[PDB]
Design a protein around this ligand. Structure first.
Ligand SMILES: Nc1ncnc2c1ncn2[C@@H]1O[C@H](COP(=O)(O)O)[C@@H](O)[C@H]1O
Ligand SMILES: [Zn+2]
Length: 886
């Protein structure tokens, strides 16, 4: 069975050498149809670059006994370094059974364990650097590795436990029998064995050589290692693992056998402490070329509440620092709370770049990049909790201090651009950092699957299980060859990067050139160079949202606007003030616009509400999405000008047409929300095209319900004469019950929207019957709702909100109406409201809407696009009343 250890390439080679090439073909078909997530392109990639061709692969897949020249294949296997090493381990073993530990289930590996023990004894007799306890610990670690590796195989190799171990593993040949039964388990076992011996020997030689520096740096009096522990299953670069080492005086260091730049990082942190008052805890290290030793950092108790505030401020600072220098993979679980200091113990992932995954080329995926450029990607934003009187102190009621910590770092750094940029260029151009290009858990899962008895019975089978790695959407898949090589080798893949280059350094030191397009160094220089108040502001929002302390109105509530200052504008100068205000609104919108020059698309990042407030990208819903901004530019075009706004309205149409949206039958949410604004675009400007698109969509309680969609359907009939729509809505309205979906008393979220439909479906009087059987201020609930469907001074009063949905612009629609029905009573009150809104606009340089500084809601119903729209309607009533869709 030994020939089953052969890999596809190895099988392919021997067959060619056997004077053979015509492979069965039938088993290629048997392989080609198996459950796989590999797409055709993936398969094409793998077949060509891992194997020469599809023929070779077909040849390399030949099963067991169908194999010619078995002896010459066996001789090939027996010539392999790992096979020879397996022989030596078997032949070296000794009959005695009285020295090595009896805490068992490790019976199967006693051969490996003894061989490891004698190797370690011989080594220490030379080095004199550890004790017998330490060697005991080392063997437990090897034992646990072999246990874990072979366990899945054990459970099925059955088909009280000591009986099977006694039986199945009793003699030399009987152990050879189990390993020849699973010859891929045998190969990897010996591979892991060799790694274990080499890494331990290498470790012990390093500690012996580095000892005077270790003693001096860490104030350790002892000259002998006594204990090794905490060896996480996370191994890299030929079985290398982090370990905690305890000396015979009880003092501990952490051994990290990793490529590193710890000396540059220390000088960097010191710079940051001086320049940015970063107050980073500097962890003591003895740094060497391809490894380092680190100070053992424990979770020491914090003394008082005054220190807890300091702790969480410092935490906010670390977040600011992580943002500024593109830190990823930090993980807030893993911070060590060292008294009043949060301590990072892994800092190998500064200066990162986005993984070159495949994404579309729209403005709306480019908009996704700004999240990947935020505080959220650092790993630091929710042994890591401070502890006071055996009590864990979470961030609850300390959120404020984290926010302040972060803000102060970002503000100070903004003022220190040139010093930061000069440091980086002076000291860090060749920084080597790690890149996690695929999450560890994915790699871990893959490895476990590859440990299936079926993978261990036939290398070919293990190889195929790993073939799945080729499914991942890397732009450059040349990297997967290296992941595969770590994983068959039994390791988690690991990659490094010099921050000024665009290549990846693979686990064996090989380069993958042109992996990145821009260097990590430049990405950070620019972020630093470009750092502005707007960025600080959005990072504060992200954070406050994450800490669950975001207030959508905090920003407007905290403005000081005085009492008796500024007054009512005259008819003529009020028109001049409206246009200026709409230009201010447009410009606020454009400044936050994300353009993609390539596809002529645009999108925005904005704070939006969906049960909670979250930062998001604008999608196709009327309430707070892209149709909102669309209709506003439409209206602004109706006046003037063509230029500027043409090359933006196209971009907006491109996005709305071509993004993940619904087919839903609704006038809010999904492509069905695009109807009205397209009709309005048709009715105000020429554009048949918007009407063309408008009709295409149509073929497929007011908010959230159907009421609104019924209403726009009627608009369609009207503009196209085609009564297929009026009947469409009739059907829906006939089954639509009389009770409102919500108990509120308004339009959109109450009974008044239903009312309006009846007086559109001709059937008045019976509309008045509901108006009869019942007998704040907003359009959505409240009286402006009631007003527009059909105590005036209450409903027309100024409020400290400006939006359409439940603010002054909605009130302004009520006034626009009343002042048409009765100019003498209302034309002045109307101009009063407009003037108050414009005056506060001017003074505050913002409108009274949800959001934060530099980040006003952009939406139609709660944002500034609707306010601009309403203001424009006042200038020309040809702009229809969107509030009830006309
Ligand atoms: N300098 C250190 N002090 C204390 N514990 C550490 C240190 N470095 C690593 N560890 C621990 O060892 C494990 C991490 O190894 P690594 O992921 O390579 O940093 C975690 O469980 C840490 O708690
Ligand atoms: Zn509302």
């Amino acid at each position: 069975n030994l020939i089953n250890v052969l890999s596809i390439n190895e099988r392919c080679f021997l067959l060619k050498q056997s004077g053979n090439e015509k492979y069965d073909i039938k088993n290629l078909q048997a392989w080609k149809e198996r459950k796989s997530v590999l797409k055709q392109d993936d398969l094409d990639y793998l077949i060509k670059y891992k194997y020469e061709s599809l023929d070779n692969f077909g040849l390399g897949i030949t099963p067991i006994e169908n194999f010619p020249d078995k002896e010459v294949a066996i001789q090939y296997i027996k010539d392999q370094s790992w096979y020879i090493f397996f022989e030596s381990i078997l032949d070296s073993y000794n009959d005695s059974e009285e020295q090595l530990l009896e805490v068992d289930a490790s019976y199967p590996f006693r051969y490996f364990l003894q061989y490891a023990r004698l190797f370690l004894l011989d080594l220490n007799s030379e080095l004199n650097i550890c004790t017998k306890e330490f060697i005991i610990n080392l063997l437990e670690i090897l034992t646990q590795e072999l246990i874990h590796l072979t366990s899945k195989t054990l459970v099925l190799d059955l088909h009280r436990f000591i009986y099977y171990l006694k039986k199945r593993f009793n003699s030399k040949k009987d152990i050879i029998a189990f390993y020849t039964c699973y010859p891929e388990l045998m190969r990897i076992t010996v591979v892991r064995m060799r790694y274990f011996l080499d890494n331990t020997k290498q470790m012990l030689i390093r500690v012996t050589e580095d000892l005077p520096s270790i003693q001096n740096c860490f104030n350790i009096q002892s000259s002998e290692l006594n204990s090794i522990s905490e060896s996480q299953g996370d191994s890299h670069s030929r079985g290398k693992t982090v370990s905690t080492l305890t000396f015979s005086d009880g003092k501990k260091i952490v051994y990290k056998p990793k490529i590193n730049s710890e000396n540059k990082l220390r000088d960097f942190f010191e710079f940051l402490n001086k320049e940015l008052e970063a107050d980073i805890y500097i962890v003591k290290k003895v740094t060497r070329n391809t490894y380092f030793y680190e100070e053992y950092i424990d979770n020491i108790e914090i003394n008082n509440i005054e220190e807890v505030k300091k702790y969480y401020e410092r935490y906010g600072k670390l977040i600011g620092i992580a943002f500024l220098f593109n830190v990823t993979d930090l993980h807030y679980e893993n911070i060590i709370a060292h008294g009043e200091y949060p301590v990072i113990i892994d800092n190998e992932t500064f200066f990162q770049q986005n993984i070159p995954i495949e994404f579309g080329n729209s403005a709306t995926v480019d908009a996704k990049y700004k999240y990947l450029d935020s505080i959220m990607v650092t790993g630091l934003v929710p042994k890591n909790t401070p502890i006071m009187n055996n009590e864990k102190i979470s961030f609850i009621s300390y959120e404020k201090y984290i926010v302040t910590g972060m803000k102060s770092i970002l503000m100070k750094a903004k003022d220190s651009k040139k010093k930061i940029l000069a440091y980086i260029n002076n000291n860090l151009q060749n920084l080597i950092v790690r890149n996690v290009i695929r999450p560890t858990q994915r790699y871990a899962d893959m490895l476990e699957f590859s440990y299936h008895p079926n993978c261990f019975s036939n290398a070919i089978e293990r190889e195929k299980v790993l073939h799945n790695m080729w499914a991942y959407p890397y732009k450059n898949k040349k990297v997967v060859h290296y992941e595969f090589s770590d994983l068959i080798d039994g390791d988690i893949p690991i990659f490094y990067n010099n921050i000024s280059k665009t290549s990846l350094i693979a686990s064996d030191g090989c380069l993958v050139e042109d992996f990145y397009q821009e260097s990590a160094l430049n990405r950070c220089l620019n972020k630093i160079n470009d750092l502005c108040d707007e960025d600080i502001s959005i990072q504060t929002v992200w954070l406050e949202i994450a800490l669950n302390i975001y207030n959508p109105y905090k920003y407007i509530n905290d403005l000081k606007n005085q009492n008796s200052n500024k007054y009512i504008y005259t008819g003529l100068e009020l028109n001049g003030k409206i246009i200026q205000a709409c230009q201010k609104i447009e410009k606020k919108i454009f400044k936050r616009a994300i353009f993609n020059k390539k596809t002529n698309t645009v999108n925005w990042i904005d704070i939006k509400l969906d049960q909670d407030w979250n930062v998001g990208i604008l999608n196709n819903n009327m309430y707070d999405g892209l149709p909102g901004i669309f209709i506003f530019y439409v209206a602004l075009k109706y006046i003037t000008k063509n230029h500027k706004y043409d090359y933006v309205i196209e971009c907006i149409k491109n996005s709305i047409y071509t993004i993940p949206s619904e087919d839903i039958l609704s006038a809010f949410f999904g492509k069905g929300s695009l109807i009205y604004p397209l009709l309005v675009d048709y009715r105000l400007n020429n554009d048949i095209n918007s009407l063309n698109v408008a009709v295409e969509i149509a073929d497929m309680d007011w908010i959230h319900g159907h009421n609104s969609i019924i209403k726009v359907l009627l608009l369609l009939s009207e503009i196209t004469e085609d009564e297929k729509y009026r009947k469409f809505s009739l059907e829906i309205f006939e089954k639509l019950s009389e009770e409102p979906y919500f108990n509120f008393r308004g339009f959109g979220h109450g009974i008044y929207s239903y009312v309006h439909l009846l007086s559109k479906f001709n059937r008045i009087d019976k509309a008045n019957s509901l108006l009869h059987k019942i007998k704040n201020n907003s359009w959505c609930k409240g009286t402006v709702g009631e007003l527009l469907a059909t105590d005036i001074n209450k409903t027309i009063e100024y409020k400290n909100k400006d939006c359409l949905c439940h603010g002054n612009a909605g009130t302004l629609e009520g006034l626009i109406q009343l002042a048409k029905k009765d100019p003498e009573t209302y034309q002045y009150k109307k101009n009063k409201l407009i003037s108050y809104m414009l005056k506060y606009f001017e003074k505050n340089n913002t409108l009274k809407v949800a959001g934060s500084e530099y980040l006003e809601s952009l939406g139609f119903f709660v944002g500034i696009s609707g306010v601009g729209y309403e203001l424009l309607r006042n200038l020309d009533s040809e702009i229809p009343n969107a509030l009830l869709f006309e």
